[PDB]
């Protein structure tokens, strides 16, 4: 499982990073 | 085993293959047991007592031949054997002026930072006794306030052998910043202020200042030249980069943090 | 016996109640924030870690015979903690051994039995993953023992308990190092022992074994984890390079590890002070005295803590090495009233022109001066005796003759005047220049500080500082 | 280096520019601090 | 006292300098910060037989200072004397920078194999397959399949 | 283990740390969106 643990935590980086960019668009839009 | 111990010891040392044989002796010293911790067998420090002494005279050989990069190579290996990691160190008498040779090597080369970090290790050794350290620190207590060529008025007190090779550097390292300070706002002086006060009424010291420096004695003066600048300013060279700070100010202040 | 007999029942239950429950809540809450709280870089038990700095130094020292603290250690070291049924057995044992303390006798472990008590953290399916829990349970053999300040024959068992705790570094570095960041808890534990293992190695010889240990213990920083572990060991690295009197100090300057960016306003405050003495011995003063002043005002928030006594001592020593004249007792303490009295006389003779009076006091009070670790003042204080006078004149007179500044300084003659007017400019004392037409020493005035861009240079750091606080605030806010 | 080269021949911590600034009038202003609101 | 031992020019002290290079190899690596050229010029000696061993102790000192690429480039040029030395927890950090530099080089060369390829150092891959041999001999093969995807080979 | 597992086991550390980090950063941004969305809806 040890190679899979290294790959899946990489996949939990940018899939979690795009949510960070997402709320920046949300909170900027809700001020309008 | 004790290769040519006191052959050319006292009188002279003109031999050149002696040093490789002396290094050949030093091949044996680092290869008997060890040098770095020198933990056990205290008798293996007993040739290291004499391995101190053969580098002492090796430093005396370097001061005979005026070898500055060797004289620090000997002294550092000696001091790191005066800082043997088993520091028991039975007292040799030639240590206290060898450090005085180190303390005058180092004082004459603008190592005043190296001076005042050296004195930390010997609190009462450097003061209460040891005239070979008491004289270079009374030199340094002279070297605080106004006594730097009053030093030359106290030149004639050498407790050891001549010490000439490092009072000549002390001759050198004073008379050149003397020449540096007269290039500065000490603007110009006549020949007789260079005579009575620098020192030594006229030898080829006038050849020293006219050739190492300029300051040609023309009609009754040493003459200074131009030592000024123009001082330009633009203050809109920052107007590209001060705008870079202002854009950065509203950058982080507007971003959703 | 009638007088001392009735005074026996009240002393046990006050440690048996509140000293019982505090680590019982801490060892529970940090465990729940070791299992949960994946972002436990800053636990709230880090303030309890700061409480355990203050707690056991005053709460308990001895194991409190008449059976109060003597039963805590066989309770709290008997922890196997298998699963929820076999931890609730131990959760009953927090209650059940309280009857063993009160009704029965406790298990008296007089300074020796705690080391074989470290087999109950192996007996009957114990836990090795809870290296915070066993790491605190490796501090607890020290906590009555070391903090009682015995320093007597259990120093070797202080050492062997720490070797078991250095074997817990091995269990951190080899046994299941899975993302728990427990080193930043263990480094403060590696601090606590090595404040007294520092003192232990002050009761004995040098530390070159620990030097090989400390460099390797510093080595695993900056790659694995780096917060406050690099910092606290670096003061422990510096303090005995300083305490030993060798060259020792340019090694510190090239030790380019100065910057773990914060140390919670306590370790970073003294860190500036240890390196402030380092930069002072190589004759740099103005750069030294400004971080001397920075270290005094950074964390002084106690009453005469002991190194506050020392930074306030050394601060105007180097300011009496430039020659500005502040003196001392404007912030005086009851632990300072004794320690000011030789230092009292030291700074008054700077302003006056009497030096045999100064050489009287140095001969009078040299033993206290040598106790302070300030041997090398006199090789450079007689320097500043005439430097304080010449700066005071140059600050007074705007255009002074050489022929007058001498005779005021009881200096007899207009040559002995500018026997102090050619290195002071080179040392950065006075702006003034000297013409060899008049021999007069005149300085000028600074006006362009507001006329040219001095203010907006200084503002750009402080604009950048204030926005960081706004950034540290919003990032650390919405935890609900 | 450079001899500065020449031809010719209590405990008053800025509490002294406080205390040598201080010697002849106010000692009956040390608990003379309170008598002034019925006449003056 | 140990720095100035690297000044002398006879070869009988050069092979005794390495007898004193591995002597002082333990602790005072901060002191060797001022001794960069005294390893480097000693590395430029071809009459010095063990010049790769000078790159061993150089990869020791630039790891102390944190010159991680400079330790990496001298782990390259240290040849067989570095290739024989891989049983430590010192060397596991500098092979970590190796594989990291290796797999980003291989994806770079997998982008454009049609000309202007950056040639991989053979001593860079000399420890790559050698550490892959440790996968073959330490019984573990989920690790042996693990690099084999990431190496892009 | 030191040559073939430690290259991965030390590397999955920081891959765990950033996912550990930005989850705190995410739920801060989550609650701020719920404040404004409850403000606009009302």
Identify all chain C residues contacting B237, using CB atoms and an 8 Å cutoff: none
Cα–Cα distance, C60 to C68 (Å, whole number) = 10
Ramachandran sector of residue C228 (left: φ over 0; alpha: ψ -120 to 50; beta: rest): left
- Output the CA–CA distances (angstroms, integers) from residue E39 to E3, E55, E129, in the order listed: 10, 8, 30
Cα–Cα distance, C109 to C70 (Å, whole number) = 7
Identify all chain B residues contacting D4, using CB atoms and an 8 Å cutoff: 146, 148
Cα–Cα distance, C23 to C55 (Å, whole number) = 11
The alpha carbon of residue D25 and the mean position of all alpha carbons in its chain are separated, in whole angstroms, by 12
| DSSP, res C12 | T
Its sign, for the CA torsion C33, C35, C38, C42, is positive
What's the reported resolution, in angstroms, to a tenth? 3.3
| E140–F contact, CB cutoff 8 A | yes
SS3 of B14, please? coil
- Judged on CB neighbours under 10 Å (0-12, 13-18, 19+), F25 is middle
Element (H, E) at C230: helix C229-243
Residues E111/E113/E115/E116 CA torsion (nearest 10 deg): 50
| DSSP, res C119 | G
Give the nearest partner residue to F29 out of A9, A10, A23, using CB atoms. A23
Element (H, E) at C370: helix C366-372
User: Widest CA span of chain C, in angstroms?
Assistant: 99
C179–F28 CB contact, under 8 Å? no
- As given in the structure block, the two tokens for residue C322 are 């430039």
A2–E145 CB contact, under 8 Å? no
B30–E24 CB contact, under 8 Å? no
On the CB side of B13, how many CA atoms lie within 13 Å of its CA? Answer: 21
Q: What is the DSSP string of C325-346?
A: ---STTS--TTTHHHHHHHHHH
CB C287 within 8 A of CB C271: no
Cα–Cα distance, B127 to B135 (Å, whole number) = 9
Q: What is the DSSP string of D1-40?
A: ------------TTTHHHHTT-SSS-STTSS-SS--SS--
Partners of B217 in beta bridges: B222
Identify all chain C residues contacting D13, using CB atoms and an 8 Å cutoff: 326-330, 347
Partners of C400 in beta bridges: C441
User: Widest CA span of chain E, in angstroms?
Assistant: 55
- Output the CA–CA distances (angstroms, integers) from residue B240 to B148, B235, B243, B244, B247, in the order listed: 51, 10, 6, 7, 11
**C394-422 burial string, b = 16+ CB within 10 Å, else e?**
beebeebebbebbeebebeebbbbbbbbb
Nearest to A18 by CA among C39, F22, F34: F22
Identify all chain E residues contacting F4, using CB atoms and an 8 Å cutoff: 131, 134-135, 138, 140, 143-144
To the nearest whole Å, the CA of E123 is away from the closest chain F CA by: 17
Q: Chains touching chain F at 3 or more Cβ pairs under 8 angstroms? A: A, C, E
Give the nearest partner residue to B181 out of D2, D6, D7, using CB atoms. D2
Nearest to B228 by CA among B172, B184, B178: B184
| DSSP, res C129 | S
Identify all chain E residues contacting A3, using CB atoms and an 8 Å cutoff: 142-143, 145-146, 149
Nearest to E128 by CA among E88, E75, E61: E75
- Rounded to 5 degrees, φ, ψ at E46 are -90, -20
| F30–E contact, CB cutoff 8 A | no
- Which residue of E24, E29, E33, E95 to mutate against C (max C Cβ within 10 Å)? E33
Cα–Cα distance, F22 to C295 (Å, whole number) = 35
To the nearest whole Å, the CA of B217 is away from the closest chain D CA by: 19
To the nearest whole Å, the CA of A15 is away from the closest chain E CA by: 21
Nearest to C251 by CA among B77, E58, E30, B113: E30
Contact yes or no, D with B (3+ CB pairs under 8 Å): yes
| D15–C contact, CB cutoff 8 A | yes
CB C134 within 8 A of CB C168: yes
**Helical H segments across E30-127, by residue range:** 37-43, 51-64, 68-76, 79-83, 91-111
Cα–Cα distance, C297 to D24 (Å, whole number) = 37
First to last CA, chain C: 59
C478–F17 CB contact, under 8 Å? no
Residue of A nearest to F26 (CA): A20
Ramachandran sector of residue B156 (left: φ over 0; alpha: ψ -120 to 50; beta: rest): alpha
- Which residue of C38, C173, C182 to mutate against F (max F Cβ within 10 Å)? C38
- Rounded to 5 degrees, φ, ψ at C424 are -60, -40
To the nearest whole Å, the CA of E74 is away from the closest chain A CA by: 29
Interface of B with C in 205-244 (CB under 8 A): 235, 238, 242
CB atoms < 10 A from the CB of A28, how many? 11
To the nearest whole Å, the CA of F20 is away from the closest chain C CA by: 6
Identify all chain A residues contacting B256, using CB atoms and an 8 Å cutoff: 24, 27-28
Identify all chain C residues contacting B191, using CB atoms and an 8 Å cutoff: none
Cα–Cα distance, C168 to C131 (Å, whole number) = 7
| F15–E contact, CB cutoff 8 A | no
Q: Alpha-carbon Rg of chain E, whole angstroms? A: 18
With vertex at residue C38, the alpha carbon angle to CA C32 and CA C39, rounded to the nearest 5 degrees, is 110
Name every residue whose Cβ is closer than 8 Å to that of residue E101 and which is 6 or more positions away in sequence.
Answer: E72, E124
Cα–Cα distance, B170 to B188 (Å, whole number) = 25
To the nearest whole Å, the CA of B80 is away from the closest chain E CA by: 5
Element (H, E) at B131: helix B131-142
B117–C281 CB contact, under 8 Å? yes
- As given in the structure block, the two tokens for residue B144 are 């605080």
Residue of A nearest to E144 (CA): A3
Cα–Cα distance, B26 to B50 (Å, whole number) = 11
| B85–C contact, CB cutoff 8 A | yes
- As given in the structure block, the two tokens for residue A31 are 């001020």
| E83–F contact, CB cutoff 8 A | no
Cα–Cα distance, C207 to C204 (Å, whole number) = 9
C256–E93 CB contact, under 8 Å? no
CB atoms < 10 A from the CB of B243, how many? 10
**If you count residue pairs, one on C and one on E, with CB atoms under 8 Å apart, how many are there?**
15
Name every residue whose Cβ is closer than 8 Å to that of residue C207 and which is 6 or more positions away in sequence.
Answer: C201, C240
On the CB side of B38, how many CA atoms lie within 13 Å of its CA? Answer: 24
- Which residue of D3, D6, D7, D8 to mutate against B (max B Cβ within 10 Å)? D3
- Rounded to 5 degrees, φ, ψ at A5 are -65, -35
F22–A2 CB contact, under 8 Å? no
Cα–Cα distance, B140 to B116 (Å, whole number) = 10
Cα–Cα distance, C251 to E65 (Å, whole number) = 12
Cα–Cα distance, C274 to C276 (Å, whole number) = 5
- Output the CA–CA distances (angstroms, integers) from residue C120 to C77, C88, C96, C159, C378, in the order listed: 6, 17, 17, 20, 60
- Judged on CB neighbours under 10 Å (0-12, 13-18, 19+), B141 is middle
Q: Alpha-carbon Rg of chain D, whole angstroms? A: 24
Element (H, E) at A15: helix A2-31
Identify all chain A residues contacting F29, using CB atoms and an 8 Å cutoff: 20, 23-24, 27
With vertex at residue B137, the alpha carbon angle to CA B136 and CA B141, rounded to the nearest 5 degrees, is 120
With vertex at residue B221, the alpha carbon angle to CA B220 and CA B224, rounded to the nearest 5 degrees, is 160
Tell me the pairing of strands C399-401 and C440-442.
antiparallel
B117–C380 CB contact, under 8 Å? no
Nearest to C276 by CA among C227, C314, C331: C314
| A5–E contact, CB cutoff 8 A | no
Residue of F nearest to C39 (CA): F20
CB atoms < 10 A from the CB of E74, how many? 26
SS3 of E113, please? coil
Residue of D nearest to C346 (CA): D11
Cα–Cα distance, C245 to B118 (Å, whole number) = 9
Identify all chain E residues contacting A10, using CB atoms and an 8 Å cutoff: none
Residue of F nearest to A9 (CA): F15
Give the nearest partner residue to D11 out of C344, C412, C413, using CB atoms. C344
- As given in the structure block, the two tokens for residue C1 are 């016996």
Identify all chain C residues contacting F9, using CB atoms and an 8 Å cutoff: 177
Sheet with strand C440-442: strands edge to edge = C399-401, C440-442, C433-434
CB C186 within 8 A of CB C172: yes
SS3 of C441, please? strand
SS (H, E, C) C408-439: HCCCCCHHHHCCCCCCCCCCCCCCCEECCCCC
- As given in the structure block, the two tokens for residue D13 are 């911590």
With vertex at residue C178, the alpha carbon angle to CA C173 and CA C183, rounded to the nearest 5 degrees, is 50
Name every residue whose Cβ is closer than 8 Å to that of residue C2 and which is 6 or more positions away in sequence.
Answer: none
| B256–A contact, CB cutoff 8 A | yes
CB C410 within 8 A of CB C420: no
Give the nearest partner residue to F21 out of C39, C224, C480, using CB atoms. C39
User: Widest CA span of chain B, in angstroms?
Assistant: 85
With vertex at residue C436, the alpha carbon angle to CA C431 and CA C441, rounded to the nearest 5 degrees, is 30
- As given in the structure block, the two tokens for residue C411 are 């200096």
- As given in the structure block, the two tokens for residue C243 are 């305490």
B148–D6 CB contact, under 8 Å? no
- Output the CA–CA distances (angstroms, integers) from residue C287 to C197, C272, C282, C291, in the order listed: 33, 12, 11, 7
CB atoms < 10 A from the CB of B48, how many? 18
């Amino acid at each position: 499982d040890l190679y899979s643990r290294y790959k899946k935590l990489q996949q939990e980086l940018e899939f979690l990073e795009v949510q960070e960019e997402y709320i920046k668009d949300e909170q900027k839009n809700l001020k309008k | 085993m004790y290769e040519q111990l006191k052959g050319e010891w006292n009188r002279k040392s003109p031999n050149l293959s002696k040093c490789g044989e002396e290094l050949g002796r030093l091949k044996l010293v680092l290869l008997e047991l060890n040098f770095l911790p020198t933990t056990g067998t205290k008798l293996t420090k007993q040739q290291l007592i004499l391995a101190r002494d053969i580098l002492e005279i090796g430093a005396q050989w370097s001061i005979l031949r005026k070898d500055i990069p060797s004289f620090e190579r000997y002294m550092a290996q000696l001091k790191c054997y005066y800082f043997d990691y088993k520091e028991q160190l039975p007292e040799s008498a030639y240590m206290h002026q060898l450090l005085g040779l180190n303390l005058l090597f180092l004082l004459s080369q603008n190592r005043v930072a190296e001076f005042h970090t050296e004195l930390e290790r010997l609190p009462a050794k450097d003061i209460q006794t040891n005239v070979y350290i008491k004289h270079p620190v009374s030199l340094e207590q002279y070297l605080m306030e106004g006594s730097y060529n009053k030093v030359f008025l106290a030149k004639g007190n050498i407790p050891a052998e001549s010490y000439t090779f490092f009072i000549d550097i002390l001759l050198d390292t004073i008379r050149d910043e003397i020449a540096g300070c007269i290039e500065k706002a000490y603007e110009k002086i006549l020949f007789t202020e260079a005579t009575r006060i620098l020192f030594f009424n006229t030898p080829k010291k006038m050849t020293d200042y006219a050739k190492k420096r300029g300051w040609v004695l023309g009609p009754n003066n040493y003459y200074s030249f131009a030592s000024q600048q123009q001082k330009p300013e633009d203050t809109t060279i920052p107007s590209t980069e001060l705008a870079k700070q202002v854009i950065e100010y509203a950058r982080q202040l507007e971003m959703i943090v | 016996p009638p007088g001392g007999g009735e005074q026996e029942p009240p002393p046990p239950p006050a440690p048996q109640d509140v000293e019982m429950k505090e680590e019982a809540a801490t060892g529970g809450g940090s465990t729940g924030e070791a299992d949960g709280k994946t972002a436990a870089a800053a636990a709230e038990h880090s303030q309890r870690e700061l409480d355990t700095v203050t707690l056991e130094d005053i709460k308990e020292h001895v194991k409190q015979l008449e059976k109060a603290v003597s039963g805590k250690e066989p309770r709290f070291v008997l922890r196997a903690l298998r699963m929820l049924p076999s931890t609730s057995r131990r959760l009953n044992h927090y209650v059940l051994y309280k009857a063993v303390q009160g009704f029965f006798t406790s298990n008296n472990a007089t300074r020796d039995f705690l080391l074989p008590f470290l087999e109950e953290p192996m007996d009957t399916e114990a836990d090795l993953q809870f290296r915070p829990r066993t790491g605190k349970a490796a501090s607890t053999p020290l906590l009555p023992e070391v903090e009682a300040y015995l320093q007597l024959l259990v120093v070797i068992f202080m050492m062997n308990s720490k070797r078991y705790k250095e074997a817990q570094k091995i269990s951190d570095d080899l046994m299941q190092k899975i993302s728990t960041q427990n080193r930043r808890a263990l480094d403060l534990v590696a601090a606590k022992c090595y404040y007294y293992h520092a003192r232990v190695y002050e009761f004995l010889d040098k530390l070159d074994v620990v030097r090989s240990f400390l460099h390797a213990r510093l080595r695993t920083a900056t790659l694995r984890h780096d917060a406050d572990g690099q910092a606290t060991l670096l003061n422990l690295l510096l303090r005995n390079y300083l305490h030993y009197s060798l060259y020792d100090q340019a090694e510190k300057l090239v030790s380019k590890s100065v910057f773990p960016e914060q140390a919670n306003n306590n370790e970073w405050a003294r860190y500036l002070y240890y390196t402030g003495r380092i930069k002072a011995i190589q004759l740099e003063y103005s750069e030294a005295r400004r971080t001397m002043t920075n270290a005094l005002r950074k964390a002084p928030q106690h009453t005469a803590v002991g190194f506050k006594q020392t930074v306030h001592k050394l601060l105007i020593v180097v300011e009496l090495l430039l020659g500005e004249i502040p003196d001392r007792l404007q912030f005086r303490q009851p632990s300072l009233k004794r320690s000011l009295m030789p230092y009292f006389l030291l700074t008054q003779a700077v302003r006056t022109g009497n030096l045999a009076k100064f050489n009287q006091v140095l001969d009078q009070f040299g033993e206290k001066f040598q106790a302070d670790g300030t041997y090398t003042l006199i090789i450079r204080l007689r320097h500043n005796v005439i430097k304080t006078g010449v700066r005071m004149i140059s600050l007074s007179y705007s255009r002074i003759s050489l022929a007058d500044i001498a005779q005021k300084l009881q200096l007899d003659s207009p040559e002995d005047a500018e026997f102090i007017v050619a290195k002071a400019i080179r040392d950065g004392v006075i702006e003034a220049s000297i013409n060899h037409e008049k021999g007069y020493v005149q300085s000028k005035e600074m006006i362009d500080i507001y006329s040219t861009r001095e203010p907006q240079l200084a503002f750009h750091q402080r604009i950048s500082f204030c926005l960081d606080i706004h950034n540290m605030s919003v990032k650390a806010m919405r935890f609900p | 280096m450079s001899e500065k080269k020449q031809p010719v021949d209590e405990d008053n911590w800025d509490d002294d520019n406080v205390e040598d600034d201080f010697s002849n009038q106010l000692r009956a202003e040390l608990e003379k601090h309170g008598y002034k609101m019925e006449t003056s | 006292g140990i720095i100035s031992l690297l000044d002398e020019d006879e070869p009988q002290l050069k092979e005794f300098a390495l007898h004193k290079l591995n002597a002082v190899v333990n602790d005072f690596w901060a002191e060797i910060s001022e001794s960069v050229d005294k390893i480097e010029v000693l590395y430029e000696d071809e009459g010095f037989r063990s010049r790769q061993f000078a790159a061993l102790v150089a990869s020791k000192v630039f790891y102390h200072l944190g010159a991680f690429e400079e330790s990496l480039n001298y782990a390259l040029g240290a040849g067989d004397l570095f290739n024989v030395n891989d049983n430590s927890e010192y060397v596991e950090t500098i092979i970590a920078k190796c594989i990291d530099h290796y797999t980003k080089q291989c994806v770079e060369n997998a982008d454009l194999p049609e000309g202007e390829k950056k040639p991989i150092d053979q001593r860079l891959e000399g420890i790559v397959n050698k550490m892959f041999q440790r996968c073959l001999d330490d019984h573990k093969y989920k690790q042996a399949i693990g690099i084999a995807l990431e190496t892009r080979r | 283990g030191s040559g073939l597992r430690q290259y991965y086991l030390s590397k999955i550390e920081e891959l765990q740390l950033i996912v550990n980090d930005k989850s705190q950063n995410l739920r801060r941004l989550q609650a701020q969106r719920n404040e404004l969305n409850a403000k606009v809806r009302l």
